Amino acid sequence: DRVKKIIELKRKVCGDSDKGFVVINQKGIDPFSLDALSKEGIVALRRAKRRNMERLTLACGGVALNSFDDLSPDCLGHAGLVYEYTLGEEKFTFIEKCNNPRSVTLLIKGPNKHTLTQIKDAVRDGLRA
Amino acid sequence: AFTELQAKVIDTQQKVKLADIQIEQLNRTKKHAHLTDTEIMTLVDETNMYEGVGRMFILQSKEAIHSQLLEKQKIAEEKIKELEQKKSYLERSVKEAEDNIREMLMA
């Protein structure tokens, strides 16, 4: 049921494959669905963090459902550019130039130590100053 | 104090739950007494017809049994009025009093 609802939504929003459509799922997606959605012109990100779930609604947009019903682009948000970046054992998809660039993400790199924690509150107090 | 007036309308809620289930029986007993009257008004072949309350089934002619079975649906028709008026009355008693309870405790 949920596989067939993705197909009607892509033709509802885009109408073509020249205009993209991005699904950020907070849960994992079937890989046979990730094969079938890839041919339709859809990228479908999975296992998304629940902290990212509210902030993407604020700047980009997009509300939560348990269906993929036919929705206009007014009900969804927009991003200007989506790029999947890779560093480490996980892929880290960059999503920039929002519908409203209201939140700016400060992406630090680090050895994933307390040094990464020590540079976290340092730039935090850097922003508060 | 204010604890006692809370428990009165809560005890009134369970009386509505008793009032809600009585109308489900009396609507069923009207239609079922109507349903058995239809099956005996269906046949024209035989005036033989058995009625009973226990496991006894007395031999009578069917025509006098119809008019009694006309009265069987009718008493169950009479009771759904007095219960639904009662069920609405107990509903109006608790819900309008429930408007008094929560808004003045939260005040």
């Binding site: 849960k27 779930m53 939560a64 459902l65 348990n66 | 099956e39 046949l43 058995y50 009973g52 089934f57």
Partner: protein, 103 residues
């Protein structure tokens, strides 16, 4: 948030127990329709058949008892499939309304 997902799955499971009482209640009756229609055809039907349930005996024949036997058996097996589809459709409906509310 993940609490709207894990609690909505508890809501669909409780309707599976609400599905549970109604379909099996009819399902016990169709096997009684199974055992009755076989004994009637084996026994003599030239003498007149009646319909005896609790509280009423209407004096009948075999030709009026026989079709309702095959009718009431077929009506039960349709509803136990029908009661399954409706309550499982209800579990799908409450999940999407919980996700569109607290977002």
């Amino acid at each position: 948030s993940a609490e709207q997902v894990i609690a909505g799955f508890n809501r669909l499971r409780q309707e599976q127990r609400g599905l549970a009482s109604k379909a099996a209640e009819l399902e016990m009756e169709l096997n009684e329709h199974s055992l009755v229609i076989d004994t009637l055809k084996e026994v003599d039907e030239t003498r007149k058949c009646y319909r005896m349930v609790g509280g009423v005996l209407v004096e009948r024949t075999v030709k009026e008892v026989l079709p309702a036997l095959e009718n009431n058996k077929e009506q039960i097996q349709k509803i136990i499939e029908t009661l399954t589809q409706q309550l499982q459709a209800k579990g799908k409906e409450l999940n999407e309304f919980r996700e569109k509310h607290n977002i």
